[PDB]
Amino acid sequence: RKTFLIDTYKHLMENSSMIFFVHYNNLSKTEDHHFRFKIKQTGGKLTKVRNNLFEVYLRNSHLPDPCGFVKRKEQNWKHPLLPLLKGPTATITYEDTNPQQVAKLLKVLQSAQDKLMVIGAKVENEVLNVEKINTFKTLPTKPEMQSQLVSVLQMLSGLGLVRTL
Amino acid sequence: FKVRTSVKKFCSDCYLVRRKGRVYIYCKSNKKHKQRQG
Amino acid sequence: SQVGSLPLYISPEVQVSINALSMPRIIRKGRTSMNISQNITVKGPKGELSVEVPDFLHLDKDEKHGKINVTVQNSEDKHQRSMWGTVRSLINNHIIGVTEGHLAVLRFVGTGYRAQLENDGKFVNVKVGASIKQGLDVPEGIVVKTPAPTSLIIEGCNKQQVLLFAAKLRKFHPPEPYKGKGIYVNDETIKLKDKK
Amino acid sequence: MSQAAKNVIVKLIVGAGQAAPSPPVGPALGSKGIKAIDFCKEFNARSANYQPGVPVPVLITIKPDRTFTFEMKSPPTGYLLLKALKGPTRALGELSLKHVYEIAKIKKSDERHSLLEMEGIVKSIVGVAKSMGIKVVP
RNA sequence: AUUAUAAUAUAAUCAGUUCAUGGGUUUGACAAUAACCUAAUUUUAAUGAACAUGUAACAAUGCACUGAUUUAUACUAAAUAAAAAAAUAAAAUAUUUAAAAUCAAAUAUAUAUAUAUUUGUUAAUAGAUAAUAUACGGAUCUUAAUAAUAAGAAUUAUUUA
Secondary structure: OOHHHHHHHHHHOOOOOOOOOEEOOOOOHHHHHHHHHHHHHHOOOEEEEOOOHHHHHHHOOOOOOOOOOOOOOOOOOOOOOOOOOOOOEEEEOOOOOOHHHHHHHHHHHHHOOOOOOEOOOOOOOOOOOOOOHHHHHHOOOOOOOOOOOOOOOOOOOOOOOOOOO | OEEEOOOOOOOOOEEEEEEOOEEEEEEOOOHHHOEEEO | OOOOOOOEEOOOOOEEEOOEEEEEEEEEOOOOEEEEEEEEEEEOOOOEEEEEEEOOEEEEEOOHHHEEEEEEOOOOOHHHHHHHHHHHHHHHHHHHHHHOOEEEEEEEEOOOOEEEEOOOOOEEEEEOOOOOOEEEEOOOOOEEEEEEOOEEEEEEOOHHHHHHHHHHHHHOOOOEOOOOEEEEEOOOOOOOOOOO | OOOOOOOEEEOOOOOOOOOOOOOOHHHHHHHHOOOOOOHHHHHHHOOOOOOOOOOOOOEEEEEOEOOOOEEOOOOOHHHHHHHHOOOOOOOOEEEOHHHHHHHHHHHHHOHHHHOOOHHHHHHHHHHHHHHOOEEEOO
16 A cells, blocks of 8 residues: 555654654553654654565665555565565554653653554664663663754754864 | 785775875775785 | 766746856867856855856756756766766856855864864864974864864865865874874774773 | 763672762762761661662762762662572573562662563573673573 | 666664683783574563564674784774666676677578688876987978967878779
C-alpha cells in the first residue's frame, strides 16, 4: 500500500529526536491516549504502522515515496529483517532518539510494557542494534538542548573559533 | 626516503602520490614508510 | 563532478558575477588545451577577490533561495570535470572569506619561542631559536594580530594566501617529535616519541 | 554541552568481595580518585552469606566523583561448575545438563544474570567448562 | 566471476571473551595455543524439566585487523550506512589479460542457413647505469577556434590510392 501512510512512517523516522513505535495489538487505550498526549506535548498524532509496505518503506531510503503501484513482492527481499514489526504497530508521530523525550513516554510505556510490544532499535541516523539496545539505552544522545527546532537548531550561532590561547 | 625501483605502500596510513614524473609514497603515521620510485 | 554539482548559497550582501577577460590566455598541454577566458569575482563586506577561469565553465544564477550552480560544457571530458570541482570549491572559499573571513592561529611552543609585530603589522618578526633574526613581510590582504607573544593569528579574505603565509611562518621551525616544540598551524598534532 | 562522558570501573583481574578496603585495590580506587571504606557498610549488605566472601566479579563502577554505584554479579561463573564438581570442553569433571540447568537457575537467581535466560546461561556454562578444567554433559 | 546501483561520509567498537594453557607479566598482540559462541528488558536464590517460531533464536557483525601496555587500561578496531530516472551505464573483492572455449565477422560445401576452415582479446611511466662530444645520420617532428589558398606527426597499430 505505502502511499501517504508510508509517508507517516517516514514522519516517525524524520529529524529531531525521541521516537515511540509499539505493537498496535494489545495496546492499552488509556496508555495509547497518554502516548498521543506525549506526542501532543511536542505536537502530533499517533500513526498506525502495518508490515508488507513498512519493509518496502524501510527498503527505499531518501527515495521517491512508494505507493499502491509499488508491491512488497515485486521488491527484492535480501534483508530478512525488512519488516521490523511482527504485526500491526501503533506509533505516535515521534522523531528520532532522545532520552529526555522518551523518559515521559517510557513512564507510560512501563505501566503496560507487558501488554504492548516495543520495536527493536533499527539503524536510523546512526546504526541501531536491538541486541545491543541495552548499551544504546545506557549511552543515549546528549539531551542538553530541549528547544530542538525552535531556537538552537541553526540559530544557536555558536562562535567557538579559537577557545584556547 | 627509501629511493627504490619497487614502491609498495606498507601500512593503511601510507598514501601514493604522483609528482615530478615520480611515484612517491608518503605516510601520515610512520615516517620510515617514505619511498620514491627511482 | 560530485563537488561541482553541489550548489552554492549566497546572502544578499555578496554578489558572484562573471565576465570575459581583457586578454584571454591559453594553457597548452601536450595533447589537450585549456583557454582561460572568463573571470569570476566574489565581492562582499570584508573585501573583494577574483578567479580567472576557463571558457567551458559557466555559472547559473537563480533568484529563488539564493542558490547558484556551476556547470561545464562537457562533463565527460576529464580535464573539464577536474576543473569544475576545483572552481566551485574556490568560489565557495571566496564566499566564506568575504562574508566571515579565513583565520590561521599559530601557537609557538618552546622556551623563548614567540612572535612579534615589528613594523606596525607589516613584518612578523619570529624568534624561534636563532642568533640571526627571522621573519617575513605580511602580504596584501593578510592582517596579522598577536593576542599573546606565543600565540599569533593570521587573518584574510583568501583561504589560499593566509594558509600559505602560515605555512611559511611555520617553516622556520616545524614541530620536533622529541619535545613537542616549534610552530603549530591551526589544529596541528605530532606524535611525541618516548624520551629514553 | 553535557553528554554521556566516561569515568572508571574497578576490577582489574576480576576481584573478590565480602566488603573491605582491599589491599592495594582500595588504594587502586584511590588511583581512580575515590575511596573504598564506608561503601563496605552497604557493600557488606551486598557482600556476605554462607559463601566465604565469594570473588563475584567486583563490579566497582564509579561515577564522575567519589559518589558511586558499586555492585557485583552471580557466583563466579566458572566457580559455579568448579564448586559443583569440586576432548569435550576441558573434560575432567563432567556436569550433567540437569546440574548445568541447576547452576543456570543459581546464575539467573542473581539479578545481574536474571536478564540472561537460563538456556543462554547453560550455553555460557559450557563456555566455563571450555575454559576451566570442567565438562558439560549434553 | 561475486556481490550494484544500497561507499568514502557515520558512530559504536560490544554478548562467551578476560578465548582456553602455561604464565612475576600477559583481559589484543608474552610466547606458545585456540578460533567460533551466547546474548534479542522492561524487571531476580542454594537439592530437576527439550528448550519452544515468539512472526521469528540464526546473523563471524571481529578470537579487539593491528599495533599500543609490564599485561591491561587507554586504545583504532570486522559490524558499514546516509546520498539510486532506477539500469542501460560509473560500487567494491578478486581473478583475468584470452577467439583454445564461447561469441561475432567471414570462406567453403548441400544450400532457405545445414557442417568444416579462417579472422577478432593491453597501455604508459619507473627500472635506465663511465670516462675526448649532444649524436633518431642531421634538422627536427605530438597543433591552436579566433584567422591566412594554407598547419595539424615526420610516432605506433591496421589499412586505402
